[PDB]
Design a protein around this motif. Sequence first.
Motif, PDB file in Angstrom:
ATOM      1  N   UNK A 125      -6.783  53.002  24.121  1.00  0.00           N
ATOM      2  CA  UNK A 125      -8.008  52.506  24.750  1.00  0.00           C
ATOM      3  C   UNK A 125      -7.850  51.033  25.142  1.00  0.00           C
ATOM      4  N   UNK A 126      -7.302  50.234  24.224  1.00  0.00           N
ATOM      5  CA  UNK A 126      -7.154  48.790  24.443  1.00  0.00           C
ATOM      6  C   UNK A 126      -5.965  48.488  25.382  1.00  0.00           C
ATOM      7  N   UNK A 127      -4.869  49.214  25.190  1.00  0.00           N
ATOM      8  CA  UNK A 127      -3.674  49.021  26.021  1.00  0.00           C
ATOM      9  C   UNK A 127      -4.003  49.307  27.491  1.00  0.00           C
ATOM     10  N   UNK A 128      -4.790  50.356  27.724  1.00  0.00           N
ATOM     11  CA  UNK A 128      -5.182  50.768  29.047  1.00  0.00           C
ATOM     12  C   UNK A 128      -6.029  49.708  29.721  1.00  0.00           C
ATOM     13  N   UNK A 129      -7.001  49.182  28.990  1.00  0.00           N
ATOM     14  CA  UNK A 129      -7.842  48.088  29.466  1.00  0.00           C
ATOM     15  C   UNK A 129      -6.975  46.889  29.904  1.00  0.00           C
ATOM     16  N   UNK A 130      -6.065  46.448  29.029  1.00  0.00           N
ATOM     17  CA  UNK A 130      -5.166  45.330  29.330  1.00  0.00           C
ATOM     18  C   UNK A 130      -4.277  45.584  30.553  1.00  0.00           C
ATOM     19  N   UNK A 131      -3.666  46.768  30.620  1.00  0.00           N
ATOM     20  CA  UNK A 131      -2.770  47.130  31.710  1.00  0.00           C
ATOM     21  C   UNK A 131      -3.433  47.055  33.070  1.00  0.00           C
ATOM     22  N   UNK A 132      -4.763  47.156  33.108  1.00  0.00           N
ATOM     23  CA  UNK A 132      -5.496  47.055  34.360  1.00  0.00           C
ATOM     24  C   UNK A 132      -5.372  45.655  34.976  1.00  0.00           C
ATOM     25  N   UNK A 133      -5.175  44.652  34.130  1.00  0.00           N
ATOM     26  CA  UNK A 133      -5.013  43.286  34.582  1.00  0.00           C
ATOM     27  C   UNK A 133      -3.622  43.114  35.206  1.00  0.00           C
ATOM     28  N   UNK A 134      -3.533  42.382  36.328  1.00  0.00           N
ATOM     29  CA  UNK A 134      -2.238  42.239  36.989  1.00  0.00           C
ATOM     30  C   UNK A 134      -1.159  41.484  36.217  1.00  0.00           C
ATOM     31  N   UNK A 135      -1.562  40.637  35.275  1.00  0.00           N
ATOM     32  CA  UNK A 135      -0.607  39.952  34.381  1.00  0.00           C
ATOM     33  C   UNK A 135       0.146  40.890  33.440  1.00  0.00           C
ATOM     34  N   UNK A 136      -0.494  41.976  33.019  1.00  0.00           N
ATOM     35  CA  UNK A 136       0.060  42.824  31.971  1.00  0.00           C
ATOM     36  C   UNK A 136       0.887  43.931  32.587  1.00  0.00           C
ATOM     37  N   UNK A 137       2.192  43.871  32.349  1.00  0.00           N
ATOM     38  CA  UNK A 137       3.090  44.961  32.776  1.00  0.00           C
ATOM     39  C   UNK A 137       3.434  45.920  31.642  1.00  0.00           C
ATOM     40  N   UNK A 138       3.270  45.464  30.406  1.00  0.00           N
ATOM     41  CA  UNK A 138       3.482  46.305  29.236  1.00  0.00           C
ATOM     42  C   UNK A 138       2.690  45.707  28.077  1.00  0.00           C
ATOM     43  N   UNK A 139       2.250  46.548  27.140  1.00  0.00           N
ATOM     44  CA  UNK A 139       1.495  46.086  25.992  1.00  0.00           C
ATOM     45  C   UNK A 139       1.514  47.117  24.866  1.00  0.00           C
ATOM     46  N   UNK A 140       1.553  46.622  23.636  1.00  0.00           N
ATOM     47  CA  UNK A 140       1.367  47.456  22.460  1.00  0.00           C
ATOM     48  C   UNK A 140       0.255  46.792  21.669  1.00  0.00           C
ATOM     49  N   UNK A 141      -0.705  47.603  21.245  1.00  0.00           N
ATOM     50  CA  UNK A 141      -1.825  47.130  20.441  1.00  0.00           C
ATOM     51  C   UNK A 141      -1.694  47.673  19.016  1.00  0.00           C
ATOM     52  N   UNK A 142      -1.746  46.751  18.060  1.00  0.00           N
ATOM     53  CA  UNK A 142      -1.616  47.082  16.652  1.00  0.00           C
ATOM     54  C   UNK A 142      -2.699  46.383  15.854  1.00  0.00           C
ATOM     55  N   UNK A 143      -2.838  46.808  14.607  1.00  0.00           N
ATOM     56  CA  UNK A 143      -3.680  46.097  13.673  1.00  0.00           C
ATOM     57  C   UNK A 143      -2.951  44.866  13.164  1.00  0.00           C
ATOM     58  N   UNK A 144      -3.731  43.851  12.836  1.00  0.00           N
ATOM     59  CA  UNK A 144      -3.200  42.611  12.320  1.00  0.00           C
ATOM     60  C   UNK A 144      -4.111  42.103  11.186  1.00  0.00           C
ATOM     61  N   UNK A 145      -3.498  41.531  10.143  1.00  0.00           N
ATOM     62  CA  UNK A 145      -4.312  41.046   9.016  1.00  0.00           C
ATOM     63  C   UNK A 145      -5.147  39.819   9.406  1.00  0.00           C
ATOM     64  N   UNK A 146      -6.370  39.736   8.892  1.00  0.00           N
ATOM     65  CA  UNK A 146      -7.232  38.585   9.172  1.00  0.00           C
ATOM     66  C   UNK A 146      -7.943  38.159   7.900  1.00  0.00           C
ATOM     67  N   UNK A 147      -7.994  36.839   7.627  1.00  0.00           N
ATOM     68  CA  UNK A 147      -8.628  36.398   6.370  1.00  0.00           C
ATOM     69  C   UNK A 147     -10.137  36.657   6.303  1.00  0.00           C
ATOM     70  N   UNK A 148     -10.837  36.495   7.423  1.00  0.00           N
ATOM     71  CA  UNK A 148     -12.302  36.591   7.464  1.00  0.00           C
ATOM     72  C   UNK A 148     -12.800  38.023   7.693  1.00  0.00           C
TER      73      UNK A 148
END
Lengths: 537, 537, 537
Positions: free
Chosen positions: C445-468
Amino acid sequence: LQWGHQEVPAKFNFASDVLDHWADMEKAGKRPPSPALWWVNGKGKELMWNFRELSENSQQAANVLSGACGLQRGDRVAVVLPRVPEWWLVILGCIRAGLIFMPGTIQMKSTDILYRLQMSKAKAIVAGDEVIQEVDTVASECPSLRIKLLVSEKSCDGWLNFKKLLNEASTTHHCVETGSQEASAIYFTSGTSGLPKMAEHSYSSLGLKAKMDAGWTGLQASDIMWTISDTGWILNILCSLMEPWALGACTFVHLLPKFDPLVILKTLSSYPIKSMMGAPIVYRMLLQQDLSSYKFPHLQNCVTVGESLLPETLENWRAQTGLDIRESYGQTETGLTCMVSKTMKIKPGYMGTAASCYDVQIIDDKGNVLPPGTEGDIGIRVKPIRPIGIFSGYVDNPDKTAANIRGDFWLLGDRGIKDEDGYFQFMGRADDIINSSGYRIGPSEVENALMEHPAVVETAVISSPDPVRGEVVKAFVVLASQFLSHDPEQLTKELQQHVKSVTAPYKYPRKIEFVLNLPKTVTGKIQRAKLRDKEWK
Amino acid sequence: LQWGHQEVPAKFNFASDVLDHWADMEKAGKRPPSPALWWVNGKGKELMWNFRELSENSQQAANVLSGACGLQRGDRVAVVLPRVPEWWLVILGCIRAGLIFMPGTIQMKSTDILYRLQMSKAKAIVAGDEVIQEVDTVASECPSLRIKLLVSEKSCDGWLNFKKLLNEASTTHHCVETGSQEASAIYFTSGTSGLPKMAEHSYSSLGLKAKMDAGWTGLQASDIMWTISDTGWILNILCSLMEPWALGACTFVHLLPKFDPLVILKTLSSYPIKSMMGAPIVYRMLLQQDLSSYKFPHLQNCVTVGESLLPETLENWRAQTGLDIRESYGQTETGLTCMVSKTMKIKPGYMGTAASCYDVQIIDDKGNVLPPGTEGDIGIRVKPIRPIGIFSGYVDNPDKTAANIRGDFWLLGDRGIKDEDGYFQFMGRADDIINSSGYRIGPSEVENALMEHPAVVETAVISSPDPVRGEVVKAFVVLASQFLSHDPEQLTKELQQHVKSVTAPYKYPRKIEFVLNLPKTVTGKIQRAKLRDKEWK
Amino acid sequence: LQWGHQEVPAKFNFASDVLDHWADMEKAGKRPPSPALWWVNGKGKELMWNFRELSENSQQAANVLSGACGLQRGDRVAVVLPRVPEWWLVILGCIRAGLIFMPGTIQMKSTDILYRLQMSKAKAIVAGDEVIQEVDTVASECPSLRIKLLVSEKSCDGWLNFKKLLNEASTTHHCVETGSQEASAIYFTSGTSGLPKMAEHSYSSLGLKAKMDAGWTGLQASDIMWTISDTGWILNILCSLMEPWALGACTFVHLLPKFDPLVILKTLSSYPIKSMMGAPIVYRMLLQQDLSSYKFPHLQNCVTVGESLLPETLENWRAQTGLDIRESYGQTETGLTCMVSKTMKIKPGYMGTAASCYDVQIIDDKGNVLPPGTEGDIGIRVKPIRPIGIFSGYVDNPDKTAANIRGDFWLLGDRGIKDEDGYFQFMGRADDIINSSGYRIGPSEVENALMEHPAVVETAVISSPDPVRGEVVKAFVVLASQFLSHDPEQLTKELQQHVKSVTAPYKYPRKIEFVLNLPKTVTGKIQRAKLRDKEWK
Ligand SMILES: [Cl-]
Ligand SMILES: [Cl-]
Ligand SMILES: [Cl-]
Ligand SMILES: [Cl-]
Ligand SMILES: [Cl-]
Ligand SMILES: [Cl-]
Ligand SMILES: [Cl-]
Ligand SMILES: [Cl-]
Ligand SMILES: [Cl-]
Ligand SMILES: [Cl-]
Ligand SMILES: [Cl-]
Ligand SMILES: [Cl-]
Ligand SMILES: [Mg+2]
Ligand SMILES: [Mg+2]
Ligand SMILES: [Mg+2]
């Protein structure tokens, strides 16, 4: 669908719920070993299974189907066999293995078989020597067909040897926990137009309905019933199998390779058959024999279905045997719909009162209930609650199922009148279906067969009155100009032989009338009702 | 009498003028055979007559009465039957034979029957199994009573077998040429004091009035109406018989042996009843059932009479069924007096506008017309011209008839208010009559029953409000000093059982209050109005 | 399917079976009028329904849907509303009318809405002012969409006025006799790859399961529960609606237009809320407020779901309030799967024991049960008997349903360890799903959204740890060569705004890392597990 909803247990299976109760009674010593299946060929071979043996041997059958053949729950199995024990074993086997059995007549030709295998996408066929060749003519065109099981003394390349596999199989099979509404059987049933539809029955619409009707015939636990039927008819499953086995009674099967009335008579006289069921023709044929010579004082119950019983047949039977014939009524979609039970007064010309939990009525063009003494259409109330016994619908064709519901009523397609006591009188088909003896014939099946011949450029097939058979298939044939010079009796014979060569011979037109034209609606449809009206006086 | 004078033809007869028109339409081929009477017992028996059959069978009935029984024009015939077809046949038979039919309830006890037979000097009684015994207890004391006709499956010594005689009788009877003003029916009707009076109706006040109102219910020629009524009520003749048959419509009769609301509901759901009529209690009872389970989309017209329809019942019915209830109003002497017709706006709490040709008004103590919004007495203008539908008078009691005329107005005995559109609101009985469900109860009938018991030395019977039934019979009872030591709940139960044993049980006091005294006028009359006023808040 | 078979009654409906029991108790006088729904906006408006009023008003809702809108049993209805009473009324209305409700978040953008309307072929949408515009952008492309119902103070051309129709509607609706297995709800649920699937729930998997779990929260009949949830989450139906109403308890709803923790705190302090449910973030946010100033001694039960509860949050909450937080666990497909009940010892870091009748286990790669203390995959035993509470399957995608069954076990997609007492510890997602606060995010869902932008030619979306927040969406972005010269902080902000403009903003990547490449399998798939492994230490 409010239609799918019923007042049924979540699970039902005739084999585990009914047959294995009797098997267990024997094993537990709570009932002596009791005959379940008694088969004779009329040439000195007899076989009998008790309920333990029947359960064991049908568990073997289920192991053949599910184990050796790898058939999986929900797979559809065409069954096309003569009156041999393996018919009963294989049906039970499918029931145990959660397989959808699809019986048909051994009278079927290759085109009939291909239609059914392709429509159903059957995974398997169980057949005998009568149709192996017809099956092999078309099996290559049936991409879904994976298993060919042959019931025979012969082996044949490409076919598995059912009898050999059964003997090799375990007598232990764990019955599938089949749902009440889950598909158990598909019966192909002829329509007023077009080719046969797939009428789907559930575990409960057949077996729970039969359990609830058990004994309607007059049959009791320690009696023997002989149902005289083609194994492809739903009559065979409901009366030859489920009625006696719901009661723990014995079902009697005669191979009856030629439908010989003297053989039927000698059988009645020589075996202690207490109840019998056959179409009216059976009783008509028997009445032409010497009943003085072959007495059957053990026979008590004579039931009939499939065609209206003439008051004359009823009269003659009572005069020659001292017995009543008790009429019943039903169709493939509905099973046993009306009947005269053993305790009901017989009214000649009436087929009894509503069966089971059916609310059967005569209804008008709007679907409203009509008063007694008024002709209308026979219907069963299916909304808001579809009674136990009504089929699940036409497979892949819910619109066809819905088409036949008028208001809250399933239409039988018959006309009728109900008397002050609720007894129904049949007043004729309301559509273009032809009833020749037991058999239900769709006119398009016969018209299509005829049209294949180069002489036939147009044809309408209707029912026609017959003194000996009651109702016959008649074809009106418009000839290609080229065949006008042909001898009509020669060409009639040729057209009849043609129809018999291409489709099950029971449908063939016993009467052909050559005509120059056929009456048409403004949509260009042939007016069969108009032809039938003239044909029947 | 200017009273005797009316704007009517010299001769009228509902049977020859209305029913035989429909019979003749069928015979002439100008209308198809059309259902007239459709009867069911709710146990699987149904019977239906078309208009030709109804005419034939009622002509047989008239032959039984006039021929086999020798009853002559003007002879009075008590009819006390359940909801069986013979009620309809026998009434029609009396009409044909110029006999005065006198319906009563099968709830009647022997004393009720003797009162009526002696007062009327009836020549005949037609009865069923419900009252044969009660009739035989007192028939010896009825010197005028010559014919006892029993409608039953049983025979009984002393009673003629109606059903057997009817079948033996000719289907041809020449209808008596009855006069418009000639007596056709006597209905016993309760009074504010004393015992029931004989309200005489003419051929025209019933049948010509019904012919003129035909269709008020919303009913049409090809519909079915179900009026739910005791056969003794004038409601049965006006709505179960004359309304549908004036239109050539079918009347539907359910035996309804126990007044079971679930049976009523299943009947509405299973038969194509387009119009229904019953007292408000019928609709109240139906509303306590599960209407979601038994739909009746064919039902279009719901009418009520006999007790005021609560706006709550109206509301609830509309909410649960989508249908209106249309109220009507009348009494024995006047027939249908006001109603809400199918095209009128319904105003909750109002019972509609003047029926037929009636000039219905609210009038003052002088007999003058009051303006809208003013409470007074409901009256029908009967001078100088008595409208078609008003009865002929109380038999043998012209002074009682005259007593109830105030100025130019027949008094209904009800209070009311008329709105700006002419719609009437019921504001209560103006006298001591008690209305319990459909039934009209004279307090002296109940007081007399109670006084027979040795405990009761004085009693006043009044109406009392009830949450479930609306209005009930309540008795104030002064005890003999001897019964003061008795348990009141025990003695109440005993007094109630006593009243139920001696007179039709519908009159019994559902409430008894023991008191030491009752308020008296200077003439020594009990002040029931005073008791009723306190009783109703 | 053995899957379709369950140990359930044939019919079930939460509205008729549960809610109308409470309504009937009130009406019958057997329970006093009891609060059912208590809604506040936090600006001085409050509304409360008792169970009779709730039943009446939801019957009106069902009349709007089935009557005014002509929606028929089985029709699918998208519901996209804020925390207003009409959410509860409309869901109940669908339940009553046998309509499939499909809740979604008001955070949805037009593309999210079109995907759902087209996939589901929804006949109707119920929406508020938050999404009317987004719906209208795409509604023309939704050929199945016939009804647009707007819940608003405003009217809008093309939308029906829900609030006006509800008031005009009857308070009587006859509840559809819905089957236990019949579809009741569709929840769109994110996958490890691709776009959201349709998870179908039945009348019984939601409402009968809730009836069986009723009280798991500690809630009793005379208490008030506040579930803090987006109305699109299945949490809202199970805990805000069904848990309290199964018990006859009150559910408390605050509009909570801005998710303001000081507002939550003042609400807890000012209203007698005895039980609360929210995701861990709710408690984390509350802990940053001044709990000394806003005491809530009436609060007894604090439950959580949706993300693992940190032992630190648990500790701090106990220290500041004296209360436990009791963790629960589930997913859309399974509802309440594990929990710590009110009588169980709390073990910090564990989410309790199997709920209801679920056999929950840690299983190996073969689908076999592992011993305590061994990490594996969390599963629920669904063969041979699928327990009450498990969904019906993914709509139109039985292969996807089957894909997630390993041996006899439905896979949750989570790792876990079970202790000696049967308590489960969450050990992380076993796939590529991202859990950000309550929300379940599919990376495609997120990768597809990003890929629509002309800057993004490839993307992987993952979870990342956050303190808050604990866990956030992170995107790895490979840039088109043209964007290499762009300022990364500027471009990150622009890409984040882009993602927020095109899809529900809760999915947006809070972290973006620009990279020159992404690791690939030999099939060319991005290795997200490898990226996630490096990302989380
Ligand atoms: Cl014959
Ligand atoms: Cl004989
Ligand atoms: Cl057939
Ligand atoms: Cl019904
Ligand atoms: Cl009411
Ligand atoms: Cl309704
Ligand atoms: Cl005047
Ligand atoms: Cl009365
Ligand atoms: Cl924290
Ligand atoms: Cl504290
Ligand atoms: Cl297990
Ligand atoms: Cl979510
Ligand atoms: Mg041809
Ligand atoms: Mg006395
Ligand atoms: Mg791009």
